[PDB]
Design an enzyme around this catalytic site. Structure first.
Site, PDB file in Angstrom:
ATOM      1  CB  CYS A 190      -1.051  -0.039   1.131  1.00 26.07           C
ATOM      2  SG  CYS A 190      -0.365  -0.143   2.777  1.00 26.07           S
TER       3      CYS A 190
ATOM      4  CB  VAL B 189       0.158   5.975  -0.687  1.00 29.31           C
ATOM      5  CG1 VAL B 189       0.137   7.446  -0.298  1.00 29.31           C
ATOM      6  CG2 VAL B 189      -1.003   5.277   0.010  1.00 29.31           C
TER       7      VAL B 189
HETATM    8  S1  CLF Z   1       5.138  -2.435   6.077  1.00 31.44           S
HETATM    9 FE1  CLF Z   1       3.103  -1.376   6.082  1.00 31.44          FE
HETATM   10  S2  CLF Z   1       2.783  -1.405   8.342  1.00 31.44           S
HETATM   11 FE2  CLF Z   1       4.266  -3.085   8.025  1.00 31.44          FE
HETATM   12  S3  CLF Z   1       2.951  -4.839   7.584  1.00 31.44           S
HETATM   13 FE3  CLF Z   1       3.369  -3.846   5.599  1.00 31.44          FE
HETATM   14  S4  CLF Z   1       1.297  -2.764   4.976  1.00 31.44           S
HETATM   15 FE4  CLF Z   1       1.620  -3.071   7.316  1.00 31.44          FE
HETATM   16 FE5  CLF Z   1       1.266  -4.919   3.420  1.00 31.44          FE
HETATM   17  S5  CLF Z   1       0.049  -6.107   4.899  1.00 31.44           S
HETATM   18 FE6  CLF Z   1      -1.374  -5.111   3.392  1.00 31.44          FE
HETATM   19  S6  CLF Z   1      -0.145  -3.943   1.905  1.00 31.44           S
HETATM   20 FE7  CLF Z   1      -0.499  -2.419   3.602  1.00 31.44          FE
HETATM   21  S7  CLF Z   1      -2.145  -3.471   4.654  1.00 31.44           S
HETATM   22 FE8  CLF Z   1      -0.908  -4.420   6.106  1.00 31.44          FE
END
Ligand code: CLF
Ligand code: ICS
Ligand code: ICS
Ligand code: CLF
Ligand SMILES: [Fe+3]
Lengths: 480, 510, 510, 481
Positions: C151, C155
């Site tokens: 994510c 972004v």
């Molecule tokens: S580095 Fe960032 S804080 Fe750390 S574990 Fe990863 S997202 Fe979360 Fe992935 S697993 Fe999916 S894509 Fe976002 S939501 Fe949650």
């Protein structure tokens, strides 16, 4: 599309008779018939009965050991029942009849267990009485709460000239607990039936034939024994609640959930309510001659019969018990009405074939009618002429009737009639389902129940509905 | 009370107040022991004092884990093409043999009786045979009738060979029609013995006085097996992958798993009559269960066959051993798809062994099942502490002891031959174990001693369709493995599900 | 106390008196609510008043049954020949995606991160892609690298196509080397969406601007599947028996079931890279799970393929429907061995239906699992009262409703899209059902509401190796059936095991 | 095959470095080394660079700051609701996966084994999530009224879209009268779990310690300590606490396994901080020495040597009475220690172990392995700092292979080469290693077993290493043909 049922059933009789060699055909032709024309008799079920099964034909019958150990004796909860002979009979009959009881099994009751003398070759050659004596001691030590022991004779015992009666006399003195030797070896008789007579006579000769023994028992004018309800899935409990609510006192229920004490006291009662006529009319006849206790037949399958039964029984007492009958019938009416409204629409017009032992082939019919279902074929493994006589109080003219039916005959009658339901036993169940025909076990209640009484009627209707009106049938034909 | 929207059958129904009150009322007149006396004798039955006396028994059997010979005869005969078991003797027997099999497979079981009654004690049972064979042949169109005997017919001493010839003399069946027979006396051994006796009887019928035309094929006898349906299919799949030339002698896998498709099939599948006849030519016959075949293997040896017997092969080593023997016989290597299955089973075991190491078991059943199960348990780091076989000989106890000695997880393990489930109850009471591996009768031991049951032995009456899935082979070993783990996890969740008291250990991942 | 002869790990250990006393002592200073207050709020959480409020939630999710897209991306990419999932974004994601899969399959899960840190927020993530691709390619010798996004990378808005071309320009990987990519934003949909997005990305990579050379074969996409290992093998067995010309697109069945034989296989099996390339020629593509493939099927449609989508086919009807569609496509009839399996499943169902009729279920998981499960339940005479899918759309709720209306056992039933397991808790509390079909998170619902769990949905963390066995097909339907029955029968024996109180109903035969 | 271990390990380092492109090789060469001779007592020097960016695409084992903050420090606090703030992912993967045990009614008075999330959709990324958070906090207040507080664990998007969770936390703390802790533990921050620790520690300081003292009523003793950084893995902190209580101490709070907010709030009232996990929580211990003048000391409860040395070291900070209690505890448990050693040391002595864990265990468990005769031939940290590597030399012998933020490639090649008797690492390492025919025990989750801390733990620890190494499965890897 169209048939005449009496004549179609007579044709099916002729079809199956053609498959037999001439000798077997002559013996079988008198066991198959269509009900002719004649409280009230609907029909006459004229069929020969209670004779040798024909060899090699795949009879459904059991033996006298079944009738004695399995049926009458094995349910008595506070006795150890020795299956006397080799290991087989007591293994197959271990915990298969759902003659329910309250107890700590292994400690104060012994029903769902196999006790056996496990005959080896030395036992066949040198006799088994010395072994029985040792066994009885071993039971006395390891099951001290057993109030008594029965010796259920398997085939070899009588064939080798063992004297189990000598042993029973000897050890009753030695240990001070009743010992009942039963000559229910499978070679005797033609079926479970003789096992019943033999077992009944064993009750008379080794339980009733003794002292005192409950001179302390307070009686009432409303004391009855329920004779011949073996508490299949709790049937006798759901029967007893109604009899108690009507104002009677049940001294003993023979032999489901029964203790030896209850049986011992049966002579103190005022009246014998006999449900299973076949298995236990013998002891009821003895009880009318010796003690002056009358018997009456009743039936607790379905609301018509339960009402008629409660009234018939109450008419034998007084105003007070008659009023209780009506109160019980009135109390359960909302339930009966609720069952009928839920399930009669789903079952009315459906055709049933039955095959059971000695009572249920007639006794359940009225409960099927209370749900709009018709019985188009019925029959008994080991009914006597007097059971067929009584069958005409229940089945309509044109009903196909078959005594000690063969696998061949029964498969051909089910294939031909294609009823909506078959009610029979474990050895019939699976082939019938394979034919695309619903099936409910009418011995074990297919591990459900109770079916007796009003609480039973709901469960009975639920069960016939869930077997017939189920999505599995529509999936037999693969879509290509 | 009863209620049409939520119907109460027997189980919940008799717990309702009105029935509890009526049952209390009934109890007051039952003359049963008072509740303090029951507690006393219950605790006493779980004691060491009681165990010494229980094990001092010489004559009484209580809750034996075995049946009598004819059950084995009916079973083995049911694995031949359109074959009807004909049990010469009383008919109550046949009702029982059939019911027993049907309750296990949830299937039809077909068998017939000569229907000997009391008169046969004085006159002998000839007419019953002659008439019986006639009627069975005309009605049920079998290709073979396999005669066994009930204990009454044995005591009376009827000469089966003579009777069968007389029957053919009177036209009951065609002269060339196949009516193999065997004495199957209930008072010798058990159902495994009747499997052997009937199977020999069948083979002797087709082999007597013939000279082999040797081939390199192998006859495989699976023996008396609660899991015949899946096991025989697994066996065939394995043999097919290896490309072994074989004949299964007695295959009930189709007979006890016919479809529900509008037709009832009285017979289905089976060893072909011609394959049973050509089986005398094989150079090898292997039995998958020693104790089901000693007479039969001796008979095969009498035609110069080389013979091997296994003990209900379960797990990695036992399967490996079977495959190696098959490879030695056929000349064919083990194919790579089977090494993969093997390597994947090893992988499962390695992934899950933390939950198996140290677990203690009681195991009972037929001698071969018990050997094979105990052996599998040792592969997992488990301890088969109480092994028991009612129909287990001293020679078996020695074999079990050799198995124990082969592994450090065997120290302390015993094999109890000729003891019964009342004996087993005292073992489970006095020397607690984690798990009980047995048959449905073992539920009573679960009740009496809080030892959870795993059902891997005939009969399984209170579960449905387990027989449809293999336990043999690498695939089958994985099922067993998962069946153990499932019972173990599950017991772990039950130990840890009580909120704020035990659920600190209610792990999402295990 | 602790004891070396019988070692107590955490579960029994903290139940010992000294720890009970120390934990009571700790509790006195914890300032937690008093025990009467806990009872009050517990009961309140199981009330109808609470259910109305809990269902009035608009923003808070509690115990959702779904993951985010990249999990689905990693999954689908892992079913291609020597393919490494490369998730462009932060690395903590990859630790989690891998751990999640490993805990379910009890297997390795390999995946890499571009390892984007804070500075990528200002400078963008180019160097991470260039360097990452270089290092993943040299170290792990993949045949294909499948790029998805976390994510943070979404972004920030990194242009993946440009970055990958730049990477090739700088020699990170050979020019012709396969680097399909997809945007897999965690904040749209769920893991099923990333399955779709990544699969489309892979197909687009090989198909973009090509002209089919049509053949009559069918591409089959199994979707996101906790039971991929047994299911895909069952699928292949079925397709083999039918003789259908096919290509499975994404087959993780070998990748997540490699042997333990001394070698660690980073990659095993998969859709071949060439077959993925030739898959554009197929006239058909079928998805076994609609909600895993809408974008991918639309893409396949853009090359003139005809498409069909199923809902996780479980049981008789759904399998029948799949076989019929296959038959229509291939022109080949259903072979007799499959009619036998079918007829045998029907037989099992008929033998056992007394225990299934009337049973009520709550069911949750991915939308297709829930549909297929609910449908199977209806075949058995069961009622799928509470169906729930956190990732289930309104279009799904409509489809579920059409399913309910097709059978009289559907009358009560609702489908709750976009609700979570805290919602489900209130359903189970207020409208009791017999059984819960879900995933391991559902054990908390078993604890909270006394509704026994059956695990048929990803993830299964607290049982081992269930994934190795099919649930699709007639064979798989029989496993599911036996899994239900087993749960039902355990429960019946547990209801009836208490001696002298409930054991009147402890039947030996059921 | 005979070898020299230090030189064999240096060779393995050279082998793996050859597989990298030149850019990655230059970055990785400083993370791999063999422990040198030394420049309590120092056994070796573990000179390796640490705590920097992971190299892209190399299959690092590291997690993110959210793991360090939500998964590690905050999520175990039992009577708070922890909001995983952002999309659904992170809170699903971290749901109930760390076995930080606790006593509670979950859903009712504790919220550990649960996922609370804001479940960010695209509208939330575009228009911001603060209005959503406000609504969420209200909804938590209504539906989980026994929660004494709420933490907002920020996942990657939060800081990237400029959401102001601190404004929200200030606003809602006033509105609902319950502590709200916003934590900026987004995964893009830092290089690993480590910064998540510092951030989370600083969030304890800034939103729990920075407030009206909630417990002026608390009676103190001269024997009050906090246990800082034992997260109660399989009940580790409970088996640690029984020994500290038996010695005569009172445990005001154990951070953060089985912890309530109350226990944390009171930490300033204690006399001494016993720090087990130095790495995760030295930060708050340094704050607690500056602000409140509460000293800290490092201890270690893995194995009898360390437990004895730790009980004594700690007791020496108090008086005669507590020193006598130390000896009483050491004496009481000696028969147990003796029994474990006699049962299991014969079965494990001489066996070689490789380790790889996060920030503490790669050194801390070594002495317990040595108490069973086992040697550590390789160890390494996901996210250790220079000061963790410094301390590693109190535990590992010269010639031990040392690897910081090791790669899948490197670690596989080192395990293939060394073929130790045991590997101790995490879930993502377990299965490949078992496939290679090598026993493996998880050194994070304890493979669903435990506790390992303390004396009751040492038995279970030995049992577990024995049952993984000495089991029949290994002998069956090679098929007999
Ligand atoms: S580095 Fe960032 S804080 Fe750390 S574990 Fe990863 S997202 Fe979360 Fe992935 S697993 Fe999916 S894509 Fe976002 S939501 Fe949650
Ligand atoms: S006793 Fe008889 S065969 Fe009257 S031997 Fe049989 S429990 Fe049947 S028709 Mo099994 S004369 Fe009872 C019977 Fe009826 S065992 Fe039960 S169901 S009412
Ligand atoms: S907190 Fe840390 S990685 Fe000190 S982030 Fe990690 S429960 Fe490890 S080596 Mo998992 S610094 Fe704890 C740890 Fe050690 S989660 Fe546990 S085992 S002693
Ligand atoms: S009519 Fe029992 S099964 Fe058969 S062979 Fe002897 S032991 Fe065995 Fe009736 S009494 Fe019993 S059941 Fe039959 S044998 Fe006779
Ligand atoms: Fe069947």
């Amino acid at each position: 599309d169209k048939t005449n049922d009496s004549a179609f059933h007579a044709r099916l009789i002729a079809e199956v008779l053609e498959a037999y060699p001439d000798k077997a055909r002559k013996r079988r032709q008198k066991h198959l018939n269509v009900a002719g024309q004649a409280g009230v008799m609907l029909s006459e079920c004229d069929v020969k009965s209670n004779v040798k099964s024909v060899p090699g034909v795949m009879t459904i019958r059991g033996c006298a050991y079944a009738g004695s150990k399995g049926v009458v004796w094995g349910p008595v909860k506070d006795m150890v029942h020795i299956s006397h002979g080799p290991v087989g009979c007591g293994q197959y009959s271990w915990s298969q009849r759902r003659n329910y009881y309250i107890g700590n099994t292994g400690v104060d009751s012994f029903v769902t267990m196999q006790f056996t003398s496990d005959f080896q070759e030395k036992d066949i050659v040198f006799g088994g009485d010395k072994k029985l004596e040792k066994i009885i001691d071993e039971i006395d030590e390891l099951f001290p709460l057993a109030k008594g022991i029965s010796v259920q004779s398997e085939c070899p015992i009588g064939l080798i000239g063992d004297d189990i009666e000598a042993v029973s006399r000897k050890k009753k003195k030695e240990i001070g607990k009743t010992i009942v030797p039963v000559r229910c070896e499978g070679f005797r008789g033609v079926s479970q039936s003789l096992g019943h007579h033999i077992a009944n006579d064993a009750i008379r000769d080794w339980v009733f034939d003794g002292e005192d023994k409950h001179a302390a028992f307070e009686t009432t004018p409303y004391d009855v024994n329920v004779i011949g309800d073996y508490n299949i899935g709790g049937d006798a409990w759901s029967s007893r609640i109604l009899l108690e609510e009507m104002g009677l006192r049940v001294v003993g229920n023979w032999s489901g959930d029964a203790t030896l004490a209850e049986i011992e006291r049966a002579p103190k009662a005022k009246l014998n309510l006999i449900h299973c006529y076949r298995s236990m009319n013998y002891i009821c006849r003895h009880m009318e001659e010796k003690y002056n206790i009358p018997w009456t037949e009743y039936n607790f399958f379905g609301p018509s019969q339960i009402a008629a039964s409660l009234r018939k029984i109450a008419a034998l007492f007084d105003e007070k018990i008659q009023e209780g009958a009506e109160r019980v019938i009135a109390k359960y009416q909302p339930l009966v009405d609720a069952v009928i409204e839920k399930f009669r629409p789903r079952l009315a017009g459906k055709k049933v074939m039955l095959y059971v032992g000695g009572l249920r082939p007639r006794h359940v019919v009225n409960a099927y009618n209370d749900l709009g279902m018709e019985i188009v074929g019925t029959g008994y493994e080991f009914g006597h002429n007097d059971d067929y006589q009584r069958t005409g109080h229940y089945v309509r003219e044109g009903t196909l009737i078959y005594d000690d039916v063969t696998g061949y005959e029964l498969e051909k009658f089910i294939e031909g009639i294609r009823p909506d339901l078959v009610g029979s036993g474990i050895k019939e169940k699976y082939p019938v389902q394979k034919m695309g025909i619903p099936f409910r076990q009418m011995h074990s209640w297919d591990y459900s129940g109770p079916y007796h009484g009003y609480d039973g009627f709901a469960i009975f209707a639920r069960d016939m509905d869930l077997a017939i009106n189920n999505p599995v049938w529509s999936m037999f034909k693969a879509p290509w | 009370p009863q209620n049409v929207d939520k119907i109460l059958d027997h189980a919940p129904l008799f717990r309702e107040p009105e029935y509890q009150e009526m049952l209390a009322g009934k109890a007051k007149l039952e003359n049963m022991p008072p509740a303090d006396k029951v507690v006393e004798i219950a605790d006493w039955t779980k004691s060491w004092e009681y165990r010494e006396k229980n094990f001092a028994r010489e004559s009484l059997s209580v809750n034996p884990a075995k049946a009598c010979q004819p059950l084995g005869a009916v079973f083995v005969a049911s694995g031949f093409e359109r074959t009807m078991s004909f049990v010469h003797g009383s008919q109550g027997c046949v009702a029982y043999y059939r019911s027993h099999l049907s309750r296990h497979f949830k299937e039809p079981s077909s068998a017939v009786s000569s229907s000997m009654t009391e008169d046969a004690a004085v006159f002998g049972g000839l007419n019953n045979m002659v008439d019986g064979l006639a009627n069975t042949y005309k009605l049920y169109d079998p290709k073979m009738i396999a005669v066994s005997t009930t204990c009454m017919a044995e005591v009376i001493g009827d000469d089966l060979h003579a009777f069968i010839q007389t029957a053919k003399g009177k036209g009951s069946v065609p002269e060339e029609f196949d009516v193999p027979f065997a004495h199957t006396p209930a008072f010798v051994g058990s159902h495994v013995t009747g499997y052997d006796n009937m199977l020999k009887g069948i083979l002797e019928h087709f082999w007597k006085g013939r000279t082999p035309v040797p081939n390199r094929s192998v006859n495989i006898i699976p023996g008396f097996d609660g899991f015949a349906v899946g096991n025989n299919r697994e066996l065939k799949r394995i043999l097919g992958m290896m490309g072994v030339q074989y004949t299964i002698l007695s295959d009930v896998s189709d007979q006890f798993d016919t479809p529900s498709d509008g037709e009832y099939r009285m017979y289905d599948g089976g060893t072909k009559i011609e394959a049973a006849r050509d089986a005398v030519n094989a150079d090898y016959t292997i039995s998958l269960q020693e104790y089901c075949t000693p007479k039969t293997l001796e008979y095969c040896q009498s035609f110069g066959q080389k013979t091997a017997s296994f003990h209900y092969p379960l797990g990695i080593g036992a399967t490996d051993d079977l495959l190696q023997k098959l490879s030695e016989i056929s000349g064919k290597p083990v194919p790579q798809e089977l090494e993969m299955e093997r390597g994947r089973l090893v992988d499962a075991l390695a992934d899950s062994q933390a939950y198996l190491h140290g677990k203690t078991y009681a195991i009972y059943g037929d001698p071969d099942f018990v050997y094979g199960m105990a052996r599998f348990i040792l592969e997992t780091g488990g301890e088969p502490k109480h092994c028991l076989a009612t129909n287990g000989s001293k020679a078996w106890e020695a074999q079990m002891q050799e198995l124990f000695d082969s592994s450090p997880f065997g120290v302390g393990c015993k094999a109890w031959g000729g003891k019964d489930l009342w004996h087993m109850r005292s073992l489970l009471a006095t020397e607690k174990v984690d798990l009980l591996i047995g048959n449905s009768y073992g539920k009573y031991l679960e009740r009496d001693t809080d030892t959870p049951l795993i059902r891997l032995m005939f009969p399984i009456f209170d579960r449905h369709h387990h027989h449809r899935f293999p336990v043999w082979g690498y695939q089958g070993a994985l099922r067993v493995l998962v069946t153990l783990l499932d019972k173990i996890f599950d017991k772990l969740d039950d130990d840890t599900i009580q909120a704020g008291v035990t659920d600190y250990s209610f792990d999402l991942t295990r």
